[PDB]
């Protein structure tokens, strides 16, 4: 519920993406950038494409439908036509296991 087990950290090679299906909720995308892990909604905010089916270059994921792109850490648009920021989900590694938050980061109680 609060944290969703994704897979073993070792299961993902750096620079790859993994889609996380959720019953009752929209799918998420977990990205492994080097040794770090980030997560955002899987659905591009510009349409209905699956970001996990796109190209990950650095910490920027490129959508496969129209070439838009986002920064996987901040969820902000990096290339047009994307304009709406992606919801970001916290990720934590414990016991070498990857966990992704069940609720997106809230514009609540922050910097």
């Amino acid at each position: 519920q609060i944290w969703l087990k994704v897979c073993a950290a070792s299961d993902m090679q750096p620079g790859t993406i993994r889609r996380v299906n959720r019953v009752g909720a929209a799918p998420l995308a977990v990205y492994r950038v080097g040794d770090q892990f980030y997560a955002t909604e899987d659905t591009c905010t510009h349409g209905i494409a699956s970001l996990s089916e796109g190209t990950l270059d650095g910490d920027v994921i490129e959508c496969p439908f129209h070439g838009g792109a986002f920064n996987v850490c901040t969820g902000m648009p990096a290339s047009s036509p994307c304009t709406v920021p992606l919801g970001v989900f916290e990720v934590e590694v414990k016991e070498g296991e990857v966990y992704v938050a069940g609720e997106k980061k809230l514009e609540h109680h922050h910097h």
């Binding site: 349409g47 699956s50 439908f65 070439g67 036509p81």
Partner: protein
């Protein structure tokens, strides 16, 4: 290359489809009805940007490119068929055979070294269900069935239709007819009530992506299409709400139609059943050039005798054609044209903001991009460099 490379590089999922603004080469296309072309009366038509000539000789149809090899004039400017099997250009009398396009004579100089050494382009032509199909392609053509939707070629299937020219690229026509949510534009249809049909405003998808459509790539007849299954796991919307308030409702009726819709290459939609539980509609979107297409719409209905036709034939002209094909589909025509500006500069292919029900359309684009038999270009039209 019919589109800016920077754009094709952005739509990595269906570039070939975006690039095919002139249509797909090496496919069959209905261009007119058999009753429209009599024996020895050549008719002109433009298909995939190419001006063509069709003639009926001994009941058989033939297709020659409508452009003389000499100075490139249209032979149709002044038709001169001096023998049953040939056509003579009105300019310098270069003469070609309808069966192989070969330059067999030149009345202005019968000693010319060109005679028998040049050949004018020809295209296969096949009649079926009272429809004329031209194979706009090179090499040996495949069975006409490969480019027809299922059930169109049924012996008992009485195929009747209508045809006209519409001012929109052919793709916009395709993506309008196969758009699950476009039914909203028909919400005020008089035919729906005058046939007490049931038609929702839209649909609330259900299940995953794959379940939304059925991609066909295993049909043995060769066909390549996609079925729209949004209605299986999805709940139809019959009540439209704005801010929790209902402002619009769908149409109620016992008649459950269109519970089966599929799009097939090179560009023909199948809506079964429609406009009645017993009938069916087949409509092609034939590319004439980059801005226009032939809206080739037909209505199929099984039969078994004269009486099972004359009554139908009477129905067609009486209600069907006027109600389903014109009265109903006319809403599709102007909706089709309303999308022209957004896609005219090819920018729409990158800026469109799609939503759930567009999953079908997306499947169609990927299918078309993967199983099209070739992209028609200006090189095929003018001077193949």
């Amino acid at each position: 290359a019919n589109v800016d490379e920077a754009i094709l590089k952005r739509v990595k999922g269906w570039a070939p489809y975006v690039d095919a603004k002139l249509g797909f080469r090496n496919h069959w296309y209905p261009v007119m009805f058999s009753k429209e072309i009599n024996e020895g009366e050549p008719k002109t038509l433009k298909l995939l940007g190419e001006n063509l000539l069709v003639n009926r000789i001994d009941g058989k149809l033939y297709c020659l490119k409508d452009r003389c090899l000499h100075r490139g004039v249209q032979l149709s400017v002044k038709v001169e068929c001096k023998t049953k099997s040939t056509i003579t250009c009105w300019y310098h009398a270069w003469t070609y055979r309808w069966e192989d396009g070969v330059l067999c004579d030149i009345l202005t100089n019968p000693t010319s070294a060109q005679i028998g050494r040049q050949k004018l382009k020809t295209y296969p032509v096949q009649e079926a269900k009272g429809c004329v199909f031209i194979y706009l392609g090179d090499g040996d053509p495949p069975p006409l069935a490969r480019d027809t939707p299922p059930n169109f070629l049924d012996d008992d299937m009485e195929i009747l239709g209508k045809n006209q020219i519409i001012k929109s690229n052919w793709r916009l026509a395709v993506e309008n007819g196969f758009d699950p949510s476009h039914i909203y534009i028909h919400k005020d249809s008089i035919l729906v009530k005058d046939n007490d049909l049931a038609l929702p405003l839209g649909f609330a998808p259900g299940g995953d992506r794959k379940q939304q459509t059925r991609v066909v790539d295993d049909d043995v007849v060769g066909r390549k299409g996609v079925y729209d299954l949004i209605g299986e796991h999805g709940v139809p919307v019959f009540e439209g709400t704005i801010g929790g308030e209902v402002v619009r409702e769908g149409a109620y009726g016992e008649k459950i139609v269109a519970n089966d819709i599929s799009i097939w290459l090179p560009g023909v939609l199948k809506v079964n059943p429609w406009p009645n539980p017993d009938m069916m509609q087949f409509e092609w979107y034939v590319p004439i050039d980059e801005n226009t297409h032939y809206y080739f719409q037909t209505l199929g209905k099984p039969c078994a005798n004269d009486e099972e036709r004359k009554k139908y034939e009477q129905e067609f002209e009486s209600k069907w054609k006027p109600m389903a094909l014109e009265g109903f589909n006319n809403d599709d025509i102007w909706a089709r044209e309303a999308m022209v500006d957004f896609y005219a500069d090819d920018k729409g292919w990158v800026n469109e903001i799609l939503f759930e029900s567009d999953e079908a359309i997306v499947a169609w684009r990927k299918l078309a991009s993967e199983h099209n038999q070739g992209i028609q270009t200006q090189a095929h039209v003018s001077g193949l460099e």
